[PDB]
């Protein structure tokens, strides 16, 4: 078995020059975005009135068409400008700035990867995005800003042409993933290191990507705990840094020697935003 320090050494020594990254809700909680709807929250209390019979319903087409308002409440919260990237995002950004990032795969819909400065070409947003929207009736496309006013004012955005409800390009349940998601066929075999941060690995097809690298490739998990294939069906070059994700990241960064560059970066970026 290898160690965090080992992986850091492989990067410092340029053994591994192409890193694929998988991330999930865990990397955004430090920015103050809740996950499970478990929490007593500004979110959970707002949706409380709305009477979602259960959390999954917010991403379900039949429920959305019956009552789009609980979902647009969520949209109001996640719309760009409300939350800021945290060190985990900035770490990924540094990883790209240094030439290490093959591709970043995110299940998050908060758009914080893009906001941190990571180029779109390097990003696969697998659950979609609030950057654009589509009319549910006529299929006419719209940039996210066209519905911004309605969303902030709590009005359901309606199509200017057909009056149909305009839905942000978030992936609902039972919908296929965006087409960029198919890059994983090229990406994963080409990858010499896999990074997995802040994810349960319960949502598919996204989850299965973990198995898609070669046996020679180390899979480093930074998460509260062991999850998915890394647990059920582990591998020799697998590595777990278990605990709070920000601490796992800060440790790696220090092992990489990037701590001071990393702080200068985050300081400059965060200051700019708020």
């Amino acid at each position: 078995k290898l160690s965090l320090q080992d992986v850091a050494e492989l990067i410092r020594a340029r053994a591994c020059q192409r890193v694929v990254v998988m991330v999930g809700a865990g990397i955004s909680t430090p920015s103050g975005i809740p996950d499970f709807r478990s929490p007593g929250s500004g979110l959970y209390s707002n949706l409380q009135q709305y009477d979602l019979p259960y959390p999954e319903a917010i991403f379900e087409l039949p429920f959305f068409f019956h009552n789009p308002k609980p979902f647009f409440t969520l949209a109001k919260e996640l719309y760009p400008g409300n939350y800021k990237p945290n060190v985990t995002h900035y770490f990924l950004r540094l990883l790209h700035d240094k030439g290490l990032l093959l591709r970043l795969y995110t299940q998050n819909i908060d758009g914080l990867e893009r906001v941190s400065g990571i180029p779109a070409s390097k990003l696969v947003e697998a659950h979609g995005t609030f950057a654009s929207a589509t009319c549910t009736v006529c299929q006419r496309p719209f940039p996210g800003e066209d519905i911004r006013a309605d969303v902030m004012a709590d009005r359901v955005p309606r199509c200017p042409v057909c009056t149909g409800v305009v839905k942000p390009d978030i992936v609902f349940f039972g919908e296929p993933l965006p087409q960029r998601f198919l890059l994983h066929v090229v990406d994963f075999p080409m990858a010499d290191l896999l990074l997995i941060l802040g994810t349960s690995l319960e949502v598919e097809p996204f989850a299965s990507l973990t198995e898609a690298v070669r046996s020679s490739v180390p899979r480093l998990l930074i998460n509260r705990d062991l999850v998915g294939p890394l647990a059920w069906h582990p591998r020799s070059r697998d590595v777990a840094q278990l605990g709070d994700v920000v601490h796992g990241v800060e440790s790696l960064v220090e092992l990489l020697g990037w701590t001071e560059e990393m702080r200068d970066l985050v300081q400059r970026e965060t200051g700019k935003l708020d």
């Binding site: 999954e56 659950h127 992936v171 609902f172 349940f173 039972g174 919908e175 296929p176 993933l177 319960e202 949502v203 598919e204 097809p205 996204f206």
Partner: peptide, 5 residues
Amino acid sequence: SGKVL
């Protein structure tokens, strides 16, 4: 395939 859990 669809997005599922």
